Amino acid sequence: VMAILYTGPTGNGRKPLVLGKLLNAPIKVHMFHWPTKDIQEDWYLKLNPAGIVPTLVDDKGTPITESNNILLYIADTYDKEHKFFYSLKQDPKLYWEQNELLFYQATQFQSQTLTIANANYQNGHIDENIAQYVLSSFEKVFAFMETKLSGRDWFVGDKFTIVDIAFLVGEHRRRERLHNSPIWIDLKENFPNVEKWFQRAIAFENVEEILKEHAAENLYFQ
Amino acid sequence: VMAILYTGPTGNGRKPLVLGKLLNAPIKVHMFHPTKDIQEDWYLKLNPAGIVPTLVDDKGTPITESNNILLYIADTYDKEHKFFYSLKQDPKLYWEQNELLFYQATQFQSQTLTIANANYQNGHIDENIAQYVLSSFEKVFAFMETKLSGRDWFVGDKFTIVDIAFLVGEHRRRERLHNSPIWIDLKENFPNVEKWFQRAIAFENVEEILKEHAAENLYFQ
Ligand SMILES: [Cl-]
Ligand SMILES: [Cl-]
Ligand SMILES: [Cl-]
């Protein structure tokens, strides 16, 4: 009956978690320990054959998967005032900007950087070849974000939206996990628009409090 | 006036090309001539990421990200919903459609094919990356094999933009990785996926559209 969000304290897991809480949506949260063998169990793979978090099981029992897609689903379903997103009829221009940035955040930020790094981290090391790939990918993503954020406060329209949630959660994760790594980049110096935007996004309502609930340590690097 | 699709001949680029051509949509296509054209100022104004493809709509607005362009062209030009499911009409299939477009872009392309293509140069790829790429493809194909079990198409009962997204990625995988250390033959372990790929390229004139390369002289095709 009631919707259930199965998730973990990760760059992808935290996105719909933040949105659901900002909306006070009737969504029960099942927070996995991290890492967990639960997502390899039969019952989970039935909900999400990709074997990744998060999964939202909706109020009819159907799984919705892919973090940035779940953002869209939760907004459409529970954000009745459109506080955190733009609908196609509401404002088509902004709707398409929102959609493209959710694809971009997923592919060019999360997938190209954090997911690749974590998949190739073992025993306190990421191989130099992968490490440089990831570093160059971060360089590209930050150049893009810096440009997009030029002359504005938020990614889309004139307010904090699901696009800001997607980007802020990835960036918060990067700072949480990679500050002590060979692939750290300090934004203060070369990407001032992104830094300014991050600080205002993390400061929005209770976003920071939500993210702190299951705070993680930096990855160890020899 | 007319919408314009700027592309190359790539895993992302052919997706909106295929849909547009299948719809006989009023979209002019310009293929750039390995190119640094996409670093030019006018192009960066349309797509600050400096990549292809970009669709500029009939009002001068750029739409980016291949799988998103699929959705936009479908909403805009697919009046009869031949190639997609709308949220209003079929919300259940709409969300399955949306999640698979995210999957194809992230797990198939970004996390796997893109990494493979970038790191396989001049017939060589570092062993550690090759191993990452192979394990990733094995997982993705297994997923697709599961999704396609007892089905002809990825979503609903017809060829859709999800099939377009997956087929273009698979076409590009074959075009670049066939004679390499990270080749995988689907016939061997993924027969559902092989059968689906053949069915998808055989759909209408898909195979023809995929053969299209830049015109020699003319700006548009
Ligand atoms: Cl996602
Ligand atoms: Cl895409
Ligand atoms: Cl990509």
Side-chain angles (χ1 to χ4, degrees), chain A residues 2-222, chain B residues 2-221:
Chain A
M2 200 180 193
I4 309 172
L5 177 72
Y6 295 96
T7 191
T10 65
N12 276 334
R14 282 155 168 176
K15 289 187 221 154
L17 179 65
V18 168
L19 179 63
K21 296 204 150 202
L22 290 179
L23 285 169
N24 280 290
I27 302 184
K28 282 180 178 179
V29 179
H30 187 284
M31 180 68 72
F32 291 126
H33 273 82
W34 212 254
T36 179
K37 283 174 45 63
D38 284 9
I39 62 172
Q40 292 153 35
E41 300 272 32
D42 283 353
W43 70 268
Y44 193 75
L45 291 185
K46 183 157 187 289
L47 299 177
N48 191 333
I52 58 174
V53 295
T55 302
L56 182 64
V57 176
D58 74 2
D59 66 1
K60 294 172 188 68
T62 299
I64 313 293
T65 66
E66 305 298 320
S67 195
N68 288 5
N69 179 56
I70 297 166
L71 281 176
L72 286 158
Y73 175 88
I74 290 165
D76 186 74
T77 304
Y78 300 106
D79 190 358
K80 302 299 192 181
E81 302 286 358
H82 297 208
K83 178 173 182 182
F84 297 114
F85 82 116
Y86 294 98
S87 75
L88 180 51
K89 274 191 188 179
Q90 173 178 15
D91 192 322
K93 190 185 287 293
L94 297 187
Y95 172 88
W96 296 109
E97 285 172 23
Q98 171 178 280
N99 223 58
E100 71 191 20
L101 289 170
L102 290 171
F103 274 96
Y104 181 93
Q105 194 283 331
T107 58
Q108 305 312 302
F109 194 111
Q110 179 65 224
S111 280
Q112 284 287 292
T113 70
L114 302 177
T115 299
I116 298 307
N118 287 310
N120 291 277
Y121 170 89
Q122 47 164 346
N123 299 320
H125 193 70
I126 298 169
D127 275 356
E128 286 146 65
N129 55 3
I130 292 288
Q132 293 168 356
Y133 180 88
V134 174
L135 196 56
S136 304
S137 293
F138 273 130
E139 290 291 354
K140 280 174 191 167
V141 83
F142 291 134
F144 174 81
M145 293 168 70
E146 180 78 1
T147 293
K148 295 306 282 192
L149 284 171
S150 184
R152 40 193 323 161
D153 279 356
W154 307 109
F155 270 100
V156 181
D158 62 358
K159 67 185 172 187
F160 180 100
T161 66
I162 58 181
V163 171
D164 305 290
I165 296 171
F167 278 108
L168 86 78
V169 171
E171 174 53 16
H172 170 275
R173 186 62 167 171
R174 181 188 73 94
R175 295 174 186 229
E176 182 184 50
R177 298 291 271 174
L178 295 179
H179 181 277
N180 298 356
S181 78
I183 53 177
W184 172 243
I185 294 167
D186 196 304
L187 300 189
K188 287 183 218 70
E189 313 159 3
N190 291 110
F191 306 103
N193 296 343
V194 184
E195 176 76 11
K196 186 157 60 65
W197 160 86
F198 180 70
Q199 294 299 337
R200 74 171 68 89
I202 199 73
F204 186 81
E205 299 181 7
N206 59 336
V207 167
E208 193 179 42
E209 175 185 332
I210 292 167
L211 290 175
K212 288 266 184 60
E213 290 178 3
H214 296 279
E217 293 193 350
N218 277 277
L219 286 173
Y220 169 62
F221 287 87
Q222 296 148 347
Chain B
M2 274 185 93
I4 296 178
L5 173 71
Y6 297 95
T7 220
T10 67
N12 282 327
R14 286 313 162 93
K15 289 179 195 158
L17 177 67
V18 164
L19 176 59
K21 293 297 177 186
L22 288 173
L23 287 170
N24 191 33
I27 301 172
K28 301 191 290 192
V29 177
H30 176 64
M31 301 190 179
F32 291 113
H33 279 101
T35 188
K36 83 112 157 311
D37 282 332
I38 70 196
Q39 296 306 139
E40 309 287 346
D41 291 357
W42 67 268
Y43 188 73
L44 293 173
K45 187 169 183 71
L46 303 175
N47 194 331
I51 83 159
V52 275
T54 300
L55 177 65
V56 184
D57 73 14
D58 61 10
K59 294 173 286 302
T61 306
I63 315 301
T64 71
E65 316 298 306
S66 207
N67 287 4
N68 178 61
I69 298 176
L70 285 176
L71 290 160
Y72 170 88
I73 288 177
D75 188 72
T76 305
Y77 295 114
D78 189 354
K79 300 194 185 304
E80 271 87 57
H81 302 232
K82 174 168 182 190
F83 294 113
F84 81 116
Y85 292 106
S86 81
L87 174 57
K88 283 218 205 91
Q89 273 128 287
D90 291 285
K92 177 183 291 290
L93 296 168
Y94 169 87
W95 296 109
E96 293 181 17
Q97 176 175 271
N98 225 55
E99 81 189 25
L100 282 163
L101 287 170
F102 275 94
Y103 183 97
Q104 194 283 326
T106 57
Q107 300 284 157
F108 190 109
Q109 179 69 238
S110 184
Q111 286 177 214
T112 315
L113 186 58
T114 293
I115 309 299
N117 277 334
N119 292 290
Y120 177 57
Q121 306 284 303
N122 289 110
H124 174 78
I125 179 172
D126 290 345
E127 178 65 347
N128 69 314
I129 306 177
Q131 283 288 274
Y132 167 75
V133 157
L134 285 177
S135 299
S136 290
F137 271 131
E138 291 290 337
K139 176 188 62 163
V140 167
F141 293 137
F143 176 89
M144 294 170 69
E145 184 79 8
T146 304
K147 280 297 174 190
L148 289 163
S149 179
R151 322 199 30 156
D152 283 348
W153 305 113
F154 270 104
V155 182
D157 55 24
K158 61 180 177 184
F159 178 100
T160 67
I161 62 179
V162 178
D163 304 291
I164 292 173
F166 278 104
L167 82 82
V168 168
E170 175 58 9
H171 178 263
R172 176 70 166 157
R173 187 185 66 93
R174 290 166 187 238
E175 164 185 51
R176 268 214 93 245
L177 309 175
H178 176 258
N179 282 317
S180 72
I182 55 184
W183 174 240
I184 299 170
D185 188 339
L186 297 192
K187 290 169 171 169
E188 306 181 357
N189 305 73
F190 308 100
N192 295 343
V193 186
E194 174 70 17
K195 196 212 314 160
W196 156 89
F197 183 65
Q198 297 301 339
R199 194 164 37 236
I201 64 180
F203 180 88
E204 298 181 7
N205 55 337
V206 166
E207 201 173 21
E208 207 183 80
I209 301 159
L210 294 169
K211 291 281 221 310
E212 291 187 33
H213 49 277
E216 257 290 28
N217 300 124
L218 293 169
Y219 198 84
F220 294 120
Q221 53 207 98

